[PDB]
Subunit: 258 residues, 4 copies
């Protein structure tokens, strides 16, 4: 069936919440067995797992802090040990930071890069090691990587610039087990990371999340916000057999937003 | 069992859909449950075989002859399209021509032969799609990995013609906003068609065999490798990809 | 000590009677190059620019030529070598702006814009290759609205220029066989009549405000809180067409001030 | 006209390669120059002498630009010694070769610590110490985006960060009229280049074959890169701001 992952096994970093959980649920709905990674949210992780079973697929929830390379090896090893194999691996887990360059401390740089940049690099490494031939790797970026220059968004933005460079090359290295590497580069997607940002990137903590959401709904010429489900559908296609001939590319899923 | 990206009750139009990538897109949209207008200019034989193929898998279709180099023919194309199927939801600009030659030997005639179809015709094919399309609709334009990624010698004219398209789709996506119509491009790499064979010179299948190893996946691009990306984009699920050139080259260098 | 001068060199700038072309031409003159000031409709300003270049101690001429007519481009490049003996540098600067929603764009309008902005630039670049000294320089002019900024009702202009970008990448390869560099400059918000006619539309109400008012408003858009001036682009161009600019070859440079 | 009289510039790793070319070029153009080394004081001394030789002043300052504390001292001592600083070139980098499967946490940390994190904080300390209307230059690679070389994923990543950095840095440094740009060198003949012509014969034999990458049929030398930095950091380069300039002479 076009678009489906029946008999495929997937892993998603940070799939208890946000775009993570919509991806896991969508791969599940598409036919794949889902390994749902969290670090701080076992409760929402279990809801995602149960939601996937309710629709007919299988899922488990493994805790692992993807800032820790040993916990990533354990994450993938345990994935393989439980479902038998891994076809698909979506590096989703990341954090936002906001600040003028003059006020960025070492501690803020390392927090962001450990997860966004370094953590995803090793999620990709262990993905290649653990993946069936024909498999899929997805990494997660930002339209603030190349397309939008928000002031005081340097640290986060470069953390993702590094992801764009990695995928192009990764798709070369990974071709030797016929694994395709792409990133998705979401724009404003309604999650707690979006609401934490809109507050700092609008003249401005005095507006309800609802109203910053309505303001940003205008940036899109479709007159709406992006949603986890929007980015999930694009990851779904990429990780299908039909999305094969997209390789080494970065897809921006923002809606034509300005 | 959930079936993604299906186009039942939708009508698609695909310029240049009797031969090559176009024919694969027409059929692919036909497989995903779209009624299809198959445009041709010179290949009525081929266009009919395409119309046939799409009825075969249980969707409706018609061939329409039209020179997308002629704006009056573009108007009449989209008119007949709406006359027959009563609506159009998806318009795909595929029709294109290749050119090869050092800037020094390029003529006014050769520039105009290429930009007439691959740039101007595509822009008016999109203008008529915006006017004839329904809200929630889909415009898809065709480019080339040569537009920006790859700098192949003696390929200026052609890569020019498509670089215009990359700019068009970004701005169009804002314009087509007021009918909630999304505009994107597919930028194919070397895809196995008559055109690829025409310019694998710069043993049709021997030169093909060379090109298999440019992609890390060690195989050529085939017309259906692009069709399936068009399929996702002109689905509901593709909506949040907008004003974006997708390069479909397999990772080719 | 004295970097990126153009002494002994000859340059041709298209549409160097007004705006960017004029300051480009003056800059290359400032830098020691003799300058062919092309124009199509502005012959008196073309002469003021020649006199300004002559006045700062170089030589220059004004040649009428419509870069929409290719034989007028061949004739332009012929006359320029006939008059100065040679040509090292060729700046494709001539273009027009168009505002309009796809729905309202006409054949006559599309052709108006593409014939000067694209076809024209292409053939300036063709005759430049043919007429130019080895080690020479070709520059074409794009816009930051070609890839960087997506502005509504700006499809036709933006596309006319996106072609320009693709062209300079491949032109660099073709033109390599005479050790000629081809780059482009993408200006963004440069105070000229083109900018004033564009601020009218891309501004909350537009004609309600003087052109200075709209200008003063655009100044905030830049991290350097000022507008772009033609001199800002002429400076980048002067580097590119210098001997020292050589290892920039095949790129589009965006000279917008870091602006949005 | 492109000159730097009364200006002071700092160049990280300007003892060797592109750096020294840049340090020597900013001197040629009238800048006084702080020459930063971490490992190579003997070359650093050569560069200071050369800049004294052509009629500008200079000083060598040891600082490992992996330690942020040593970046702080370097910039403090620079404003100490010359009593201002206009221009700051983040140059110091390293190269890494390996399939994604083979890359270790220690290699990534050796690469990012200097190429990405180090440069990030040189730019912070550049902005904190720099005069108004000043210049920050950072350093990438045509491998960040334009070219995709098997087994180059770490180096390219390290430098793709940099491209995003300079874009936003240009906005933040807009309160002190400071422009921020990266040059993205291609194959430039230095100690790092001979290192990976091997992995990707004699050096001269690998240089001769690399000369054909460019449509100008030349391999690329420090002076090529240094010229473009000289322009960006001159008054005339002001309108180039927030941009990645790829100096590969059109190569490959
Ligand atoms: N506007 C946007 O939403 C937007 C835009 C561009 C890019 N992105 C990217 O899209 C991806 C998803 O973000 P989101 O918006 O969904 O954000 P989100 O709601 O903040 O969710 C963050 C996710 O990251 C996980 N996570 C955090 N720290 C972790 C750690 N040390 N180890 C493992 N997992 C960790 C969280 O799980 P725990 O709860 O288990 O910690 C959570 O699942 C991110 O990579 C983000 O950078 C988002
Ligand atoms: N390597 C590749 O295949 C490749 C790579 C990059 C981009 N592309 C692009 O993909 C598109 C399809 O090309 P292809 O590769 O499939 O080429 P192809 O085999 O040459 O097919 C050309 C198609 O264009 C139609 N066409 C030609 N002139 C026309 C006109 N005046 N009016 C209407 N239709 C016309 C043809 O129909 P008639 O025969 O009936 O005229 C035919 O269906 C083109 O835009 C091309 O630039 C292809
Ligand atoms: N200003 C901006 O903000 C901006 C932004 C992006 C790009 N640009 C580009 O910058 C370049 C110059 O723009 P501008 O702003 O300086 O424009 P401008 O003030 O409008 O001047 C237009 C120039 O075009 C020349 N021109 C027009 N038609 C011509 C023809 N048939 N043949 C020869 N020359 C012709 C004009 O000369 P005549 O009077 O002699 O006809 C004049 O020199 C153009 O390439 C433009 O697209 C400008
Ligand atoms: N060379 C190329 O072909 C090429 C291509 C693309 C990009 N680049 C970039 O160009 C820049 C210059 O490279 P290159 O080719 O000149 O390389 P190079 O020959 O290897 O030179 C290395 C320079 O880096 C300095 N350095 C190294 N580690 C340092 C540290 N911890 N702290 C301070 N300084 C340090 C060195 O100083 P000590 O010896 O004193 O340590 C030396 O001056 C680099 O950023 C590189 O990534 C180069
Ligand atoms: C060096 C080279 C040049 C052209 C092709 C084929 C193809 C696909 C393009 O890349 C543009 C259009 C077209 O025919 C393949 C390899
Ligand atoms: C944010 C923005 C950037 C560019 C434009 C168009 C452009 C490039 C022109 O051609 C006229 C002036 C000018 O800014 C409009 C708005």
């Amino acid at each position: 069936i076009p678009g489906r992952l029946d008999g495929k096994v997937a892993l998603v970093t940070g799939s208890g919440r946000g775009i993570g959980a919509a991806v896991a649920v969508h791969l599940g709905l598409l036919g794949a067995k889902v390994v749902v990674n969290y670090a701080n949210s076992p409760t929402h992780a279990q809801k995602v797992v149960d939601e996937i079973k309710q629709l007919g697929s299988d899922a488990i929830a493994i805790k692992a802090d993807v800032r820790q390379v040993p916990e990533i090896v354990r994450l993938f090893d345990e994935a393989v040990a439980h479902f038998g194999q891994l076809d698909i691996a979506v590096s989703n887990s990341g954090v936002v930071s906001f600040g003028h360059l003059k006020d960025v401390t070492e501690e803020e740089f390392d927090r962001v890069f450990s997860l966004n940049t370094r953590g995803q690099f090793f999620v990709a490494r262990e993905a290649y090691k653990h993946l069936n031939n024909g498999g899929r790797i997805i990494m997660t970026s930002s339209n603030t990587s190349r397309d939008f220059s928000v002031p005081k968004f340097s640290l986060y933005s470069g953390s993702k610039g590094a992801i764009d460079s990695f995928v192009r090359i990764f798709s070369k290295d990974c071709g030797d087990k016929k694994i395709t590497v792409n990133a998705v580069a979401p724009g404003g997607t309604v999650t707690d990371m979006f609401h934490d940002v809109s507050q700092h990137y609008i003249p401005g903590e005095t507006y309800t999340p609802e109203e910053r959401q309505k303001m940003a709904a205008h940036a899109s010429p479709l007159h709406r916000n992006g949603f986890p489900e929007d980015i999930a559908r694009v990851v779904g296609f990429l990780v299908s057999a039909e999305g094969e001939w997209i390789n080494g590319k970065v897809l921006t899923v923002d809606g034509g937003a300005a």
